Amino acid sequence: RYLTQHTRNLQPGDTFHALVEPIGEAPLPRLRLTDSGGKPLAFGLIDQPGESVELNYTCDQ
């Protein structure tokens, strides 16, 4: 019931974008963006249509 994926290294000043689109009328999931250790950085947001979850993040490290 849990899915985790790793991403490549990001240079300073770079952005990040994610999106979830249900297909089989499945309930909207919960998506969040953390680091390797696990410290949270961003949380998903549900818009008015309720058919997509969008997350944006920028790194300064």
């Binding site: 919960r30 696990g38 410290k39 949270p40 949380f43 490290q61």
Partner: protein
């Protein structure tokens, strides 16, 4: 240089150590650095004019059962600024805790040291 000291101690489950400044100097730079030496402790440095224990305020945020994780981040930032005069970041490969503060008001101040509310899984 002016006044540098080395402090050592142990941190329990959600318990901190209180240090009280006798008199804050005017036009002075205060540097605080804390690094964990054992365990999975996450450093956190804060200061406050009064001596009220913030364990109850921090415990309420941890006790929050809100599904959305944005509230946990927002509440932690809001409760830190509205109570602590200044605070620094927690953990990290680089400067785990390095806060610079100058208070041009004089008097006795209480610097707080403890942990934060994160996850490691």
């Amino acid at each position: 240089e002016g006044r540098v000291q080395h402090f050592t101690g142990y941190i329990e489950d959600g318990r901190g150590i209180f240090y009280s400044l006798p008199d804050m100097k005017q036009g002075d730079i205060i540097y605080a650095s804390m690094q964990n030496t054992g365990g999975n402790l996450d450093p956190l440095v804060g200061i406050m004019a009064e001596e009220i224990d913030p364990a109850v305020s921090l415990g309420q945020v941890l006790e929050k059962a809100l599904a959305s994780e944005n509230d946990l981040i927002s509440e932690l930032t809001a409760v830190a600024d509205r109570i602590f005069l200044g605070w620094d970041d927690d953990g990290g490969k680089g400067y785990s805790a390095s806060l610079e503060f100058t208070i041009p008001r004089d008097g006795t101040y209480h610097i707080f040291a403890g942990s934060t509310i994160t996850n490691q899984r």
